[PDB]
């Protein structure tokens, strides 16, 4: 906004693990305010991921987030003349938000049976650097690299 | 509203009041489950003989100061415009601008 008067809102940690990171992931996945449904989906997918891999749910989730998190994005900047796509560094909070949003969108786009299964498959693919939201991170990085010459506007 | 339109309503009210019970007992006979199959027919035929204006369903609530047939309010007997005017003048007891 113009006035710069927006603070921050505290978020309760998730029940099973007490991680605000996972609580934010549940919030992103939630639709129509059905938080219990979102939590059940997330927990089922996390248990499937944990039994697929050798790490805990939090460790596997962190691996997937590390593989999907972007570092530099492109934003439009209009100056005297034409608008340029300037590459800008992404702050850590936005890195996490983008990683979660891309993962959720990719899982929703997948075509498996259940949403929990789709989320588990997407998380495993992210941990192995395959599939969507990983291609999305790659596309964002490619655009930033192509527009690197404009990193002074 | 027009004077004739107001007179229609007063006539309808008068007719309904006059024929109130003579309609009620006929309707009771018609709706009686244990009634015969010919007294029901006679009651049905007799109900049509009464003037149509005696049925209470023919009445249309109208503003008691203007005759407006739309925007009626039963609690005050007036249309919305007249209710607003009286409320602002302070003539409706206990009624003020609400806010919550």
């Amino acid at each position: 906004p113009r006035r710069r008067v927006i603070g921050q809102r505290k978020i309760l940690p998730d029940p099973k693990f007490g991680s605000e990171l996972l609580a934010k992931f549940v919030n992103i996945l939630m639709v129509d305010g059905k938080k219990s449904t979102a939590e059940s989906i997330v927990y089922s997918a996390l248990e499937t991921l944990a039994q697929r891999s050798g790490k805990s749910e939090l460790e596997a989730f962190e691996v997937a987030l590390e593989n999907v998190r972007p570092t530099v994005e492109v934003k439009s900047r209009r100056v005297g003349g034409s608008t340029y796509q300037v590459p800008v560094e992404v702050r850590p909070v936005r890195r996490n938000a983008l990683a979660m949003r891309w993962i959720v969108e990719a899982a929703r786009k997948r075509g498996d049976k259940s949403m929990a299964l789709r989320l588990a498959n997407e998380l495993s693919d992210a941990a192995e650097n395959k599939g969507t939201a990983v291609k999305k991170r790659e596309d964002v990085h490619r655009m930033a690299e192509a527009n690197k010459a404009f990193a002074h506007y | 509203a027009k004077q004739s339109m107001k007179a229609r309503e007063v006539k309808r009210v008068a007719l309904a009041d006059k024929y109130f019970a003579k309609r009620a007992e006929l309707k009771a006979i018609i709706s009686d489950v244990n009634a015969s199959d010919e007294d029901r027919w006679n009651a049905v035929l007799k109900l049509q003989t009464l003037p149509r204006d005696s049925s209470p369903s023919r009445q249309r609530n109208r503003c008691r100061q203007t005759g407006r047939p739309h925007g009626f309010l039963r609690k005050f007997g007036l249309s919305r415009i007249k209710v607003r005017e009286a409320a602002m003048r302070g003539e409706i007891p206990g009624l003020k601008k609400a806010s919550w």
Binding site: - | I30, R40, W41, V44, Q48, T49
Partner: protein
């Protein structure tokens, strides 16, 4: 439709007209404005001129018309298509 426990509806004037017509050989059309009357199995054969709003159209009552209202056979709106 009308409840069974109340029986089919019929206007008293039309009932009197059909009673006076069936016993006699009167084949003249029975002019009426009562489109709300159910067709009863007692006036099959004679023609009833039902009002449609601006005129009386004659319907020849047959057996298959029993149970329908008189107005069902007197259309009220004139339509011939757009730009036809």
């Amino acid at each position: 439709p009308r409840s069974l426990k109340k029986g089919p509806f019929i206007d008293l004037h039309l009932l009197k007209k059909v009673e006076k017509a069936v016993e006699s050989g009167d084949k003249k059309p029975l002019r009426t404005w009562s489109r709300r009357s159910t067709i009863f199995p007692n006036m099959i054969g004679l023609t009833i001129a039902v009002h449609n709003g601006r005129q009386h159209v004659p319907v020849f009552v047959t057996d298959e018309m029993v149970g329908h209202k008189l107005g069902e056979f007197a259309p009220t709106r004139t339509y011939r298509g757009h730009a036809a």
